[PDB]
């Protein structure tokens, strides 16, 4: 019971999930792709279905475009049970409306049939996790339709998402901001919580801290996977606090619609395993709460924390943690002074490649700059002119596009109102 069904949507989803499930299997002792396992440790059944001399991820793969099913069938490999791969007759361009409005209806029925199978095989649902990018024709098109239809079936089951927000890195003066805002709207409407992963932020981190001159998109995913595995791990290698997915939701989000979270980890692991740092709690916290390591590119060091929590993975002394934390509280205050809003947890299972993993999650007011950037792009392409390429046949009325913008402005305004520093 308290098991998690993970739903993987679109190519960005597949690529992150691949890295994720390989790393998680290794941590539990399960051979990724194939090879069964050896003396498995940790609460394996939350994420895996033990079959019998076999484990599979409790997961669903959605490939609207049939062209990418082999990225799971062969590249991920036999680890993800192929009967859980769902795909359509055709794909979508990068138009949210194509993936979201009355398209792939047959595909969607199958998507949910498969979700339902993973649910019926689970004693109880501790929640759902979705992984997708925000600008993709399927990624957010279906990802958003899926988010909504899941809540319709499971209104009391929290859905947590890790979504990847786009950045028009090479002059991408395209309709994508239209996709981003429409999915943002739906995230606000239906997700319990989500991690905001901004490729631009991550790009700067890979460039500045991972020392990568030009990371391929697939290399960037390694940092993403590192975050995803270490955050998720709070629920698999039991520690000092009795946590669950629902509990994380309660603790990090005090208001409806202010559920967008920042994430940060340390040490970052160089892809080539080129060097190691002394694993000092003080050093690790200095990196984790620095602006330089935040996946949102928001500089939370100038903001206020609505809620936050820190996990240390591996053996760290309480006596060092306390001084590291004292330093942090002296720099970053909390909203409404809620004295109960900051939690620390520890568990002894160290990550591979370091003595201590340090993971921080938080709900911080500077996160608005993420949504403000989206809004700005949208406005330039919308209020200035109706740029969107006639997305009307299976598309949106101006009012729907305006609704999304309105919802987004509301979330921006609410963070701004809670933290007026008075």
């Amino acid at each position: 019971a308290g098991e998690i069904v993970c739903i993987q949507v679109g190519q960005a989803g597949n690529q992150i999930a691949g890295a994720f499930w390989q790393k998680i299997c290794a941590e539990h002792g399960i051979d990724p792709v194939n090879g069964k396992a050896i003396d498995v440790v940790g609460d394996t059944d939350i994420f895996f279905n033990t079959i019998g001399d076999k484990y599979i991820p409790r997961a669903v793969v959605v490939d609207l475009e049939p062209a990418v099913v082999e990225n799971i069938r062969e590249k991920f490999g036999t680890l993800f049970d192929p009967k859980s791969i769902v795909s359509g007759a055709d794909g979508a361009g990068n138009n949210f409306a194509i993936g979201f409005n009355e398209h792939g209806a047959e595909t969607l029925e199958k998507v949910m049939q498969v979700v339902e199978q993973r649910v019926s095989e689970t004693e109880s649902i501790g929640g759902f996790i979705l992984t997708h990018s925000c600008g993709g024709g399927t990624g957010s098109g279906f990802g958003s339709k899926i988010l909504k239809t899941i809540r319709e079936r499971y209104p009391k089951v929290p859905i947590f998402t890790f979504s990847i927000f786009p950045s028009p890195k090479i002059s991408e003066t395209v309709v994508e901001p239209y996709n981003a805002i429409m999915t943002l709207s739906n995230l606000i409407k239906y997700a319990s919580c989500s991690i905001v992963l901004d490729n631009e932020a991550l790009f700067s981190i890979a460039e500045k801290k991972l020392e990568v001159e030009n990371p391929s998109l697939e290399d960037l995913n390694l940092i993403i996977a590192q975050v995803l595995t270490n955050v998720t791990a709070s629920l698999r290698f039991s520690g000092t606090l009795n946590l669950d997915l629902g509990k994380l939701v309660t603790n990090l989000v005090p208001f409806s619609n202010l559920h967008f979270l920042m994430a940060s980890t340390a040490p970052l692991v160089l892809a080539g395993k080129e060097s190691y740092e002394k694993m000092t709690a003080k050093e690790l916290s200095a990196q984790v709460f620095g602006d330089e390591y935040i996946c949102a590119a928001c500089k939370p060091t100038t903001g206020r924390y609505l809620a936050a929590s820190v996990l240390f993975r591996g053996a760290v002394k309480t006596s060092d943690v306390n001084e590291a934390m004292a330093t942090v509280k002296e720099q970053n205050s909390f909203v409404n002074w809620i004295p109960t809003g900051f939690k620390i947890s520890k568990s002894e299972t160290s990550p591979k490649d370091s003595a201590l993993g340090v993971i921080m999650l938080g709900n911080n007011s500077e996160i608005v700059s993420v949504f403000e950037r989206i809004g700005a792009n949208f406005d330039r392409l919308w209020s200035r002119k109706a740029f969107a390429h006639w997305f009307t046949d299976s598309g949106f009325e101006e009012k729907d596009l305006d609704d999304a913008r309105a919802l987004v402005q509301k979330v921006i305004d609410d963070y701004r109102k809670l933290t007026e520093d008075a």
């Binding site: 019971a1 009391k156 000092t240 606090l241 509990k247 005090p254 208001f255 002394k317």
Partner: protein
């Protein structure tokens, strides 16, 4: 009959109970493996065990949880085959640290099975003296099912005494950010449903573990000790030939003058825990005083400054009746009682002892400083509520803003009632 049924609710409840039961068994020479007895039985099994003719002493308790986890760990691994399976009662989903879910959502169906199964247990008892429930005060299910069960107990068993032992959240130890509200709801209902309660503050215990026991890196596994250790001492009078409060009813008479103000602090010593704890003293000239020292106060309140409404000081083992009597002479006068009641510390002893100790003891203290515990909790609550933090996690299940206000008022009243007794 003199039978007592324990209800262990939620993770803190079941985990502490599991430890309690391991230790009571030792006291009675019972084997954890289904409680057969290693020869003759010491103490009175009639209070806590069903005396099977088969020699099986069945601990009379329910293990209740919304999450089907701690119940399986205890039923299958920690006290395997000890608790009767029909009394292991559980749900499917836990609450996300939310009283409202524990009280309004999950559990609304389950409660009929909880109460029906309790009835089945009560039904085979010759006559109950009362019920003892154990839980975290601010736990989602702890305060949730805990309070729901209490309400239903009061309806079904109108003349039995309802006791509870519960653990308060602290600034350093807590798995939730919404505690403080789960706590005032929990406290409010208990004011309305319980006859007597003992409240232990994890803040206190930390401090004790950290500095008096000398244990760094404090963990819940040690805190649960000191909790179970105090519980096995407090309830000890119910297991032996003795005097003083030998019945839950007598406890009520001695410990709760006036209504509502029935929140007691626990005092317990020595804290041998697991340290070698060689004892060069253990003298009663210290022990009797020790139980009025902050070092053994599981409430984190200084009994020095406040007015006692009641005090029951219990000693166990080899202590001389006269030496204790003399010891009290240097306590009375540091300790003061209200002018509106019969006064003095009531004390006595039972000549038995737990393994490892020749002499030990505990005290139940009802005094005005309990208000400070409430004041800390209310202050946190007032801030949460007034700016609306986390309300949605309650509102979503129907926990109206009006219930927040209701609990706010009743708990504040308790504090006011104690404060007025200072002079």
């Amino acid at each position: 009959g003199r039978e007592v049924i324990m209800l262990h609710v939620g993770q803190a409840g079941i985990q502490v109970g599991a430890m309690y039961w391991k230790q009571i068994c030792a006291e009675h020479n019972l084997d954890h493996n289904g409680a057969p007895i290693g020869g003759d039985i010491k103490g009175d099994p009639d209070c806590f065990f069903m005396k099977a003719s088969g020699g099986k002493y069945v601990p009379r308790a329910l293990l209740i949880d919304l999450e089907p986890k701690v119940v399986r760990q205890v039923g299958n691994e920690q006290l395997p085959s000890f608790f009767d399976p029909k009394n292991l009662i559980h749900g499917l989903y836990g609450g996300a640290n939310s009283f409202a879910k524990g009280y309004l959502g999950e559990g609304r169906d389950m409660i009929d099975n909880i109460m029906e199964q309790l009835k089945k247990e009560v039904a085979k008892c010759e006559s109950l003296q009362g019920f003892i429930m154990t839980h975290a005060v601010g736990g989602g299910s702890g305060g949730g099912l805990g309070c729901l069960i209490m309400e239903k107990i009061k309806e079904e068993y109108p003349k039995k005494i309802l006791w509870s032992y519960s653990i308060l959240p602290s600034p350093l130890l807590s798995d939730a950010v919404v505690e403080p509200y789960n706590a005032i709801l929990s406290l409010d209902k208990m004011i309305q449903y319980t006859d007597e309660t003992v409240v232990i503050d994890n803040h206190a215990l930390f401090q004790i573990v950290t500095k008096n026991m000398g244990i760094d890196d404090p963990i819940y596994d040690d805190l649960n000790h000191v909790i179970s250790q105090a519980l096995s001492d407090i309830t000890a009078s119910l297991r032996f030939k003795g005097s003083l409060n030998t019945d839950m009813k007598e406890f009520l008479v001695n410990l709760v003058p006036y209504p509502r103000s029935h929140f007691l602090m626990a005092s317990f010593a020595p804290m041998a825990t697991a340290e070698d704890r060689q004892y060069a003293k253990l003298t009663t000239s210290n022990l009797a005083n020790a139980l009025f020292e902050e070092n053994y106060m599981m409430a984190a309140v200084d009994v020095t400054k406040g007015t006692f409404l009641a005090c029951s000081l219990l000693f166990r083992g080899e202590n001389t009746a006269q030496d204790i009597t003399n010891a009290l002479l240097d306590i009375k006068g540091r300790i003061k009682f209200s002018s509106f009641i019969p006064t003095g510390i009531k004390y006595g002893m039972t000549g038995t002892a737990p393994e490892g100790l020749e002499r030990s003891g505990s005290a139940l203290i009802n005094h005005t400083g309990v208000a400070e515990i409430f004041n800390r909790i209310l202050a946190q609550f007032n801030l949460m509520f007034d700016k609306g933090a986390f309300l949605n996690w309650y509102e979503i299940e129907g926990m109206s803003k009006d219930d927040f206000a209701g609990a706010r008022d009743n708990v504040q009243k308790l504090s006011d009632e104690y404060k007025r007794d200072e002079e």
